[PDB]
Amino acid sequence: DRVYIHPF
Amino acid sequence: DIVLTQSPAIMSASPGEKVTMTCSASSSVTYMYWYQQKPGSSPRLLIYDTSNLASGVPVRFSGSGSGTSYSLTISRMEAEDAATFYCQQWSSYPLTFGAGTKLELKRADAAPTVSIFPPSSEQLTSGGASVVCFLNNFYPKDINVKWKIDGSERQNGVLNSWTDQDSKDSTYSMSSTLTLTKDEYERHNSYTCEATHKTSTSPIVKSFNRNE
Amino acid sequence: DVQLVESGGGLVQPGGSRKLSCAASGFTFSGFGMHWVRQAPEKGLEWVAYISSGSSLIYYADTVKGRFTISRDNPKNTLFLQMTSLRSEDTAMYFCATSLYYGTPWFAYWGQGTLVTVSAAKTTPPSVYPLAPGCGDTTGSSVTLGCLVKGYFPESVTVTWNSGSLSSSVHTFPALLQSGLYTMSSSVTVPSSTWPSQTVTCSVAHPASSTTVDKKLEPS
Amino acid sequence: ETLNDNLKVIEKADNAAQVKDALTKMRAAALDILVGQIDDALKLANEGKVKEAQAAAEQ
Amino acid sequence: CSQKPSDKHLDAIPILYYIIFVIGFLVNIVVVTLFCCQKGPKKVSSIYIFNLAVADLLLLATLPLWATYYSYRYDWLFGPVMCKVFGSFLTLNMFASIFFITCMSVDRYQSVIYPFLSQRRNPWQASYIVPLVWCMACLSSLPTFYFRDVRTIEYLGVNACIMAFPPEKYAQWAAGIALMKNILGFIIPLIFIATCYFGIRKHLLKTNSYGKNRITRDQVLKMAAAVVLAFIICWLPFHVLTFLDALAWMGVINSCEVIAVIDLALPFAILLGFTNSCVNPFLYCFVGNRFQQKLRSVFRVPITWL
Structure with missing residues (x-):
């Protein structure tokens, strides 16, 4: 679904 | 592996009517997409993510559905909307498409214009002779064709080809080619092309004879 | 203004090979995923394959998997589809289409298409x-x-x-x-x-x- | 403005019964073509297809 | 609302990343060079400056990778092991930089309260503190070390370098880690730095009230206040965004618009933290009155070699 795609 | 079945395959719709077509999947599908494709051109995205109007699509179009049942709806039917409509599912790759739905613009009934053409001389010297009969600019598609050589019906050796709905006047056309051998052609006088249509109780007849 | 152009079609005997190409312009090419989607003559659409922007995720259709190879040339803005061991059912008009949005599984921008016929005639x-x-x-x-x-x-x-x-x-x-x-x-x-x-x-x-x-x- | 708040509800709806309550409020506000579309979206809320009823009421 | 969000911003993100990268990779390099082989060590605050500059240097050394990652719109080419290593490395250097800012503020506070502490200040005690700070940063980066992996996102059709929480209880985990990022990354360091600034300002304000002492004292006060202001300016937006994100994972806020704004602004705020790591050398090392003379000496090094 939704995820934390950012590097930090 | 998810199969998409659209309903109906064919449907006529007059301008201004509300059009609604369905798309059913065998399993629970996450998202459904709707594309319009006109004969000769590439498809265009109408609806993405099962209810979201794609950029550039008119407000008349609207997608809906969930689970295994989805639908595409046009509030006011217009001429430009007549095309074939496809649904594509995404739940997991591979992606699968639907069978398609042909949306035809319903027109007033029109009698076909019949024109008969005898075989060309070049073809005659080639060894065969094909008589052509053009039945143009009529509606609906339903039309019967009979060939009469000297009054006797000829059923073997006839190829008919229908066109799609002409975007100019919303009419159809069809060619009927009766191919015969040169020797069989060389021993008969009158060749007749009869076309029975919904618009007329009596068939439309165009014939010729090799006397002229 | 986005433009996709397919090329490489023609007549191939059954079992041959053919590399179709797709040139893209009007957008940053190496940011979105591209799909190959074919349409059989007088029949409906069919998804063939898909490749992501950096070619890390590749999906094939079950009727295509193992026989074809989709590839990408980002520095030259090109999408390749190598077809091997062609069959009669593969005869179709092929399109490169993209959603132009992260490579999502839909097709907003369609190419022109290229015809591929599979017949020994x-x-x-x-x-x-x-x-x-x-x-x-x-x-x-x-x-x-x-x-x-x-x-x-x-x-x-x-x-x-x-x-x-x-x-x-x-x-x-x-x-x-x-x-x-x-x-x-x-x-x-x-x-x-x-x-x-x-x-x-x-x-x-x-x-x-x-x-x-x-x-x-x-x-x- | 009441129709705007009930149009917020479907996007923020927890389940189908909240959609039903908001659509009945819109029906009462309409009484105070739209009526028929709301009467169909009320059917979709009653069926239990929550996401599809949200999409219908957004229309 | 429920419509899919925008992607316009991703065109500008990688370029900005590269800008910050070259700027910080020059400045921090200058600092680390002045400290590393050129004489200038043997001071505790100086050792802290060096370690902070190394953390920021190795930190911004990963900015090209993230600029490439945003260029290919989340498609990760380098593999899962590289996603692990560089994600945990990024987080480790963030925590090392922030913990070192806090440690330098504590060092300034305990050096202002105690005027009779020499510059050596038991240098081996710093040789024990530096590994302690690095180990605390590692332990704080253990979540990023355990969850930063490559996962296939089918809806994006993209092998993305994400935090691979258990998808059953993903959201919960996200919220948790977000709050942890707020506490170990902003809250506790903000408290330490703020209290240290207040105390230092108080003691200074007592000691040197009159004359030229007041002038130099006001300058140093503006320096400490500038430290706190830089940290706040370049870390408050990111952590506010992560806090709102945590609220979304909890379900308190579910508005499409708010979450779309969170995801839209998050890479910019991440870049803002990195710009803090880039700005710190100007704030700590380039402020000394010996620095400009040392810079002129380095500039004339090859001329004297001729």
């Missing part, structure tokens, strides 16, 4: 026969004329009525396959001014055989 140029009204046919406010295209292969001949009408009222009847060769016809309705007073010709162009036959439609 020869490439026969067409035979073009004129169809004019014979003697004894009266002339009304308009006259219908015909061009009969007989015995050609592969598909996609274009009958252009360039002289006199230029798509005034043209009915191009779809091709029918008889005895292993295609047959079609083109009717054109033109006012009585242009015929037989002026010259009306039909040019049948067969790119697969690279032939072009013109018929002048003389009266009889």
